[PDB]
Amino acid sequence: KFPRVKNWELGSITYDTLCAQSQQDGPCTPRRCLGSLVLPRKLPAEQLLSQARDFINQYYSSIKRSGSQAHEERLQEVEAEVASTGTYHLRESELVFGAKQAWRNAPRCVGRIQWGKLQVFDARDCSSAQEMFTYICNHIKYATNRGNLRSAITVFPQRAPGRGDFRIWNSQLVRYAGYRQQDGSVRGDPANVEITELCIQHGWTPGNGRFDVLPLLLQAPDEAPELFVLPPELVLEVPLEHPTLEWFAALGLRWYALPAVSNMLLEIGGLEFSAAPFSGWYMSTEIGTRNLCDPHRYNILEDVAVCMDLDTRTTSSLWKDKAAVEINLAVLHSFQLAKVTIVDHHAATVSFMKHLDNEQKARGGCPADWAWIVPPISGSLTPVFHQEMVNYILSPAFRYQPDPW
C-alpha cells in the first residue's frame, strides 16, 4: 500500500509513491520496528546485470534521451562486458550522475538541498597509496577553498573479484588523536583511540595534545597500509571563542573546518567503490553538541557549566541545557568570524523542508530517517520534528562497510 505522510504543524498530507521503487529490505518486519538501530541488521551476473540496466536507464532518463540509440547501444555494451568478464565500467559522466544520486538518496542527510552541486573527481586511474595521497591532498585544497567550502567527492578504483580493495583506513580525512591512559581515561577524542593506535604501530610519532591531527593510513590492494602526514597548511582549523563570555577562549578549544567522510562504500549500478571520500561543510550541532558534549567524546559540559557558575548538583537547574546552548553559540560565532562555512540547525532544517517539497514534485517522495534528521538539541523547535518521514533504501547508495583490519 502507499504510505500517508502528515505534517502535524500544518495539517498537510502527501503520499510517498517513490517507496515502491525500493528493491531492498530495511531493518524492520510486521511484528517490530527497528528504525533506531544505527547499523542495519546483517553488514552473480544476472544480479549485476539487472542492477546495471536499471542504472543505465536512470542515467538516460536524467538527460532526456531514454529510448535513444545511445541509450540502447550503452545497454548493449554493458551487457557484452558483463557476459564476458563478469563486471563493467562506468563512463565518467555516468559516475558523476551516480555520485549525485547516492547523496540525494541518503536518508540520514539533512544537507540534501545541495545535492546537485557536487564536484566529482575521477581517481579511478590510481595505482598506489602514494597516488591516493596526492588525490586526497588535491580534494582537501579544492574543498576547503580558504573557508569558502565546496562539496566534493573523489572516487578511487572499484572493487574487483580477484583482489583486495583500495581503502582509506581513517574514518574521516581529518580526525584528532585519542591517547588511552594506563588509567582508562583518554586525552583527545575517545572516538579515535583505535585509529590512533594503528597509526603509532605503523610508525607514527605521537604527540600528546588534545587536538593532534592524525596522519592518513592509505591502502592499495593486498598491501599493508602506508602512513602519510597531511601538511599542516592544508588542514584549516577554527579556534573557538564565545561572543560575550571572555573566559570561553581560555578553554583552548578548536575544531577543523572540513568534514570529510572516508570509510563509506559508494554503490552505483552494481559496482562498489570502497574508497570514495566525500566532503561538505558542518552543521554547528555536530561540533557543538555531539563532538564536544557527548559523554563519550570530549565531554566538556561540566567545565563550561562551572565557568558559567551554574548549579551543577541538580538536574532541575537545567545546567546541561544552558551550557550546551552557549557552546553551540561559540561554534557559530567562531566559524563566522574566521569566514569558514557553517550552517546552524534552524537554517539547515528549514532548507531540508524545502528539499522534501522539491522531491515530492520531482520524484513523488524522499527517503528520510527521522531520528537522524531531527537535530540533537532543540528538536521540537525545528520544523522537521513535526514532519512524518518514510525511510527506505534506493540505489545508487552510500553504505557502511567493515573496518579493513
Place this chain on the structure above:
Amino acid sequence: GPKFPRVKNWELGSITYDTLCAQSQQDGPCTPRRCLGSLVLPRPAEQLLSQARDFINQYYSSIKRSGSQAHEERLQEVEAEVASTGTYHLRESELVFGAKQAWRNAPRCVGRIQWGKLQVFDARDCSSAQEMFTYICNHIKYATNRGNLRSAITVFPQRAPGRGDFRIWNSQLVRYAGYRQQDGSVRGDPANVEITELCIQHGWTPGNGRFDVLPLLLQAPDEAPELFVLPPELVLEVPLEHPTLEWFAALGLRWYALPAVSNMLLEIGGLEFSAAPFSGWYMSTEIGTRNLCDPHRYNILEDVAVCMDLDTRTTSSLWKDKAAVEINLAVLHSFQLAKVTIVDHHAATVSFMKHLDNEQKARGGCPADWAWIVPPISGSLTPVFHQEMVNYILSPAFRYQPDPW
C-alpha cells in the same frame, strides 16, 4: 549471537537482545520494504476467547500459579461465560493487573518506572452521566492530593454488544478553551478548538480568556452527552514565574497540575474499556516546550525572546534555543515553589534507563518508541538518545479510538 533483535547503547558500548518481542501477537506499521516509526497514527467468539485465554495465562503467571487448579478453573469459567453470553467479566484483581500491564506495555511512555504504582478505581457499576461525573471528581481529588500527585486510573463499564459505549468526549480531564477569532487567530489553546465548539453547541456559556478551563462532556450508553462544569477548587493550577527574570511572572502564564488523559481505549483480554481516564504527573518539557512553544500551540517563543532582548531576526543567534530553555526552567521552578509534583527531562530519562534495565531482567525486553521517548529539547544530552529501542505492540494496551461525534 542470538535470533532476536540486537539492541545497542552507543554511549556505553553495551548490547542486549530483545526476546519479549516474541509475544507481540499483533503487527505494527512497518514492512521489509519501508520504515514507518515516525507515523503518529498507526492504521468473533473464537477471537475473544483466544485473547481472553492469553490474558488469563498472563494473570496466573504473574501470581506464579500457572498450571494450578485455580488457573484451569478460571479458563473454563471464561469459556463457559463467553459460550452462553458472547462475552465475559474480569475479577477485580485481574482488572488491577490488566490496567498496570497496559501502562507497562505503552511504548511511548517515558514514565514507566512507576508502572507498579497505579491506584485502580473500579467504576464498572456506573449507570449514568451524573455518576461518571462523581467518579471523575473523586479521581481528580485523589490524584491531585493538594500537589503531591498520585498515579490513578478509573475504569468505567466495558463495551457491550448492542448497547452504546461510555465515553468522555474531552481528550483530557483538564483542558483550556480555544476560541476561533474573526481574523482567524485563536485565543487560548489551538489544540482545543473542536472540543470548545462542541461544548458551546451543547450549551456551555463560553468565556473569552487564554486559560479558561473547559467543562466535561460525558456520555452514557445510548444518550446525548451531558455537560458538567468542574468546580474550580478541584482544578489545581500553577502560575509561572522565572527564578531570576522578574518580568516573566508579568506574562500571566499558567498551567494545570494534573495531566489526565480521557479519550483512550483500554483493552484487556479482548475486553474494551472505552472510558478509562488515567493521570500521573508532568514531565516539564510537555508544558514548557510543546504546549507553550509549539507554533500550533500557545506559540510564545518570540514574545519571550523579545523580553530577553534576543536578536530574533537571525536563526544563528540561537534565540529559539535560549528562550525555550528559560521557559522550561520557569516551569520547573514554578511547580517546585508551588509544591506540585513535576519531573525534569534529565531525571525522567535517567529513570527510564533504569526501567529498561529492570525490564531486561524481568521480561527480556521493553517496547519503546524512540522518537517519543527522546525529549523535544536537549535530546542528545539525555542518556536515551544513545540507546537503541525496539517498538512493538503487546496486550493489555492503551489504544487510540475514533472521536465519539
